[PDB]
Structures are given as C-alpha cells and as structure tokens.
Structure 1
Amino acid sequence: GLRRAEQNTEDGMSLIQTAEGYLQETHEIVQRVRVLAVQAANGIYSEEDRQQIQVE
C-alpha cells in the first residue's frame, strides 16, 4: 500500500501540474488585454481605430 499510495501521489501531482499548465496561457492573454486597454483609453483615437482594438 505504501508503494502504491506513493504512485497515486506521483500522478496526483501530475494532475495539478497539467492544470496549472493551461492556466499559464490564460494569465498571458488577460495581460494582453491589460496592455491594449491602456492604449485604448487614450484621447487621440477615433472610433475606427478603437474598434480595431476591439477586434483583437
């Protein structure tokens, strides 16, 4: 049982490892929204220009 329960833990950490692996890119994209929101909130853009930001 001790040998088996360790392998259950061995793949137990594997499940958490893959779950965080997907959340890595999820964090990246919301940052890409963050930088674009800084550009969009300016006072020099037109509706044609700001909608191209909305496209992405």
Structure 2
Amino acid sequence: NRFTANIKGLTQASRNANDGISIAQTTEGALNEINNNLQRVRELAVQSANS
C-alpha cells in the first residue's frame, strides 16, 4: 500500500511539475516581449540625445 501511494504521488507530482515549466515559459514570452520593447526605447534615447 505504501508503494502505491508513493507511485501515485510521484506521477501526479511529476504531472504538476510540467505545469510549472509551462508557467515559466509563459512568463518568459511576456518578458521577452518586454525586453524587445526596452531595446527600442534605449535606441530611441540614444537618438534623442544629440543637440
């Protein structure tokens, strides 16, 4: 009985962990978009600096 419980818990635990990776990837997409927007802002600031 103990082994069955562990096996169930491990698989389910494994099944939830994939979800954590998915959440990280989702955050990364948004973060990547933010970074892209930021790169443009820095370039614009450099252009803006000239007298």
Alignment TM-score, normalising by the size of structure 2: 0.77
**Percent identity, aligned pairs only?**
53
Displacement of 1:10 in angstroms is 1.0
Match of 1:50 in 2: none
Unaligned ranges ≥5, structure 1: 44-56
Greater RCO (CA < 8 Å, at least 6 residues apart): 1
Aligned residues: 43
Q: Compare the two structures and name the one with the higher helix fraction.
A: 2
Q: Pairwise CA RMSD of aligned residues?
A: 0.7
Q: Runs (4+) of structure 1 moved beyond 3 Å?
A: none
Residue by residue over 1:30-53, the C-alpha shift from the partner in whole angstroms, topping out at 9 and shown as x without a partner, is 11010011111101xxxxxxxxxx
Gaps of 5+ in 2: 1-8
Q: Which one of 30, 35, 38 corresponds to residue 30 of structure 1?
A: 38
TM-score by length of structure 1 reads: 0.71
